[PDB]
Ligand binder design. Structure first.
Ligand code: MTX
Ligand code: MTX
Ligand code: CA
Ligand code: CL
Ligand code: CL
Lengths: 159, 159
């Protein structure tokens, strides 16, 4: 199946012109746990913001552009990115907006990190109706010595 | 000599207990370049927010309560914080709040990272006297795909 994993501030904001104003190591840890040893599909701009390949995962970059780095697979079709993942039980789509927009219909699972940050965005996660999705997990956490914002982990599955 | 290093938000607001609402890798590089191979003095809260002993630095924790880990030196006083540093050219006082206050009078150097981030806070960096502190270095930077905020690097010699 196709699963989308995302971090969303208030108003489904997922992006800004600059790096997001939150230091959330727990979320990076949650990200990693849920993507490890699975192929991950991202857009050329998420790839650029990470600056390196995500270890122990199959990095696939979707963009109609001539690939820059040799250490990853570059593709230019939703369908093509899928083929590149081959025979795996779950493909993890990591963003951003347009990449989410393209796999959402295909997605059968959502890994969301709800962050209590009121910020003006550039990109948002597309709307998904609360009745085609079943929340099978929820876990709220307060901001702490290592995390700047409160946050809630959640996983929804298609009804 | 004693130097203090701090990342300040607008209003001289500094971190109290939870992590600050920003993401600035460049300031951690700055912090690392200026503290590496030197003893560092910090209070308890900064210690829990770091999570472990900073590599290549002698970690001295100034607290009144019982030492948690053992990779680090724990002290009950400012005068003891010094002795533990032995005689080094520079000792870096890394925060927060209280530790900054107990040392500014003995300070000759300040390494400030002014971040344009309005954070509500109870704690503020001590009031540094203008005509008692001369500016030697100012380096402004714009926010990027990796740094959430615009920031400035500064150095003041007590004169
Ligand atoms: C921009 N970026 C994209 C990003 C970030 N957080 C997210 N968080 C969630 N919930 N979902 C996403 N799709 C997501 N994407 C990044 C940045 C750093 C790392 C990374 O180095 N962090 C951990 C490891 C933690 C660390 O060593 O700092 C990893 O292996 O993924 C990953 C993705
Ligand atoms: C909470 N914390 C205290 C903190 C943070 N930034 C500061 N920044 C400045 N300018 N000054 C301080 N006193 C300061 N203190 C931290 C947290 C992490 C690291 C750190 O983990 N490693 C850095 C380098 C960054 C990295 O390893 O990725 C290092 O000093 O080696 C340092 C300080
Ligand atoms: Ca249930
Ligand atoms: Cl992208
Ligand atoms: Cl403390």
């Amino acid at each position: 199946m196709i699963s989308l994993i995302a971090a969303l501030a208030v108003d489904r904001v997922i992006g800004m012109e600059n790096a997001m104003p939150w230091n959330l190591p727990a979320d990076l840890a949650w990200f990693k746990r849920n993507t490890l040893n699975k192929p991950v599909i991202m857009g050329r701009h998420t790839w650029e913001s990470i600056g390196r390949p995500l270890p122990g995962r199959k990095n696939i970059i979707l963009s109609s552009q001539p690939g820059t780095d040799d250490r990853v697979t570059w593709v230019k079709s939703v369908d093509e990115a899928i083929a590149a993942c081959g025979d795996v039980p779950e493909i993890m789509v990591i963003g951003g907006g347009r990449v989410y927009e393209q796999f959402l219909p295909k997605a059968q699972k959502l890994y969301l990190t709800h962050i209590d940050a009121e910020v003006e965005g550039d990109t948002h996660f597309p709307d998904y109706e609360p009745d085609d999705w079943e929340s099978v997990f929820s876990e709220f956490h307060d901001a702490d010595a290592q995390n700047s914002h409160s946050y809630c982990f959640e996983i929804l599955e298609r009804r």
